[PDB]
Structures are given as C-alpha cells and as structure tokens.
Design a binder for this molecule. Structure first.
Ligand SMILES: *[C@@H]1O[C@H](CO)[C@@H](O[C@@H]2O[C@H](CO)[C@@H](O)[C@H](O)[C@H]2NC(C)=O)[C@H](O)[C@H]1NC(C)=O
Lengths: 49, 17, 48, 49
C-alpha cells in the first residue's frame, strides 16, 4: 500500500507491507500506514500514471 | 473492475505521538 | 413473630441485592456523569 | 545543542518546540517516525531528544 498526500507542499509518501492468507482481494483487516518517507517538493501535481 | 476497500487508507496524520 | 424466618429472608434479600450492585454498573451513571461534567468543564477550559 | 538538565525547571527547546518544565525519563516506547508524546487534552507529555 502506497497512500499519498499533498498538503502545504509536503508531498508525503506513506507505505505498509503486510502479508495475508488471501490471494483474491483485499481482506477484512486493518493496517495503519506509517510515513515511510516525506518529500518536501512543494510542487503542483494533479495526475499520475 | 471494482472492489470494496473496506477500512483501507487509515494512516498516521501526524508524527505526534 | 416472623423476624426469625422473615429476618432471614431480609438478610438474603439485602445480600442478594448487594451482589446485584456488585453485578451492576449502570447505576453509577449519576456520579460518572458528574465526574465527566468536571472532566469536560476542565477540558473545554483547556481547549479554550 | 548546549546541554540537557533534568528534574529542574528549565526552558527546553527541541527542534522548535518550546516549553518550561522538568524532564523526567520514562519507560514509554515510541515509533521511529514519532517524535513527541501527547495527552488526552492536547497536552505535551513526552519529547524524545
Ligand atoms: C416471599 O418472597 C421471598 C423472596 O422473594 C420468598 O423467599 C424465597 O423462597 C423461595 C422458595 O420458597 C426460595 O427458593 C428463595 O431462595 C427465597 N428467597 C430468599 C430467601 O431470599 C418467599 O418464599 C415468599 N413468600 C413468603 C411467604 O415469604
């Protein structure tokens, strides 16, 4: 999981790596995402690929 | 094509403990 | 003329409702509400 | 960084967070990204130097 954000020019890049006993879809679990890195780029972004 | 992200996207809003 | 048997029943009833209080917590609502009124009154004061 | 003194009322400034009080060592545990603690009333209660 790679939650992203862009507030106050603080382009945060979260992450979380959790293995589960499922190979079909997202499970009925719950895992918080720690701010692995933070990128103070302060640019305007509106699209990605 | 679509699925249910049940309780996903709950991170730490701050580095405050 | 009943206090032998009926005082035994009185002891049993007061004891069993003492046990019910030991098994009851919703009754403490008044004092928990007052403690929480203090808690939010201090807490709203700090938040101000 | 000049000094660190404990158990006596001083003016502590950690990376920008300012405050007056005594610094007491505690057995609490943080997370690596987490910096300073907090109470149930928006009150600072711990700061990892
Ligand atoms: C009056 O009420 C009391 C309490 O409800 C009755 O005492 C109970 O009697 C039953 C069987 O007779 C016992 O199994 C209970 O343990 C008793 N409860 C106690 C002692 O607290 C009593 O039988 C009723 N009638 C009279 C005439 O007293």
């Amino acid at each position: 999981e790679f939650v992203f954000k862009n507030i106050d020019g603080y382009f945060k890049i979260y992450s979380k790596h959790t293995p589960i006993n499922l190979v079909r879809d997202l499970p009925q679990g719950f895992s918080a995402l720690e701010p692995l890195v933070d990128l103070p780029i302060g640019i305007n972004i509106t699209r990605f690929q | 094509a679509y699925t249910n992200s049940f309780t996903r996207g709950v991170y730490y809003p701050d580095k405050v403990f | 003329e009943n206090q032998k048997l009926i005082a035994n029943q009185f002891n049993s009833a007061i004891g069993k409702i003492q046990d019910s209080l030991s098994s009851t917590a919703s009754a403490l609502g008044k004092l928990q509400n007052v403690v929480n009124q203090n808690a939010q009154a201090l807490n709203t004061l700090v938040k101000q | 960084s000049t000094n660190l003194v404990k158990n006596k009322c001083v003016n502590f400034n950690f990376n920008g967070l300012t405050g007056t009080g005594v610094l007491t060592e505690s057995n609490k545990k943080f997370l690596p990204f987490q910096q300073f603690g907090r109470d149930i009333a928006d009150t600072t209660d711990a700061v990892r130097d």
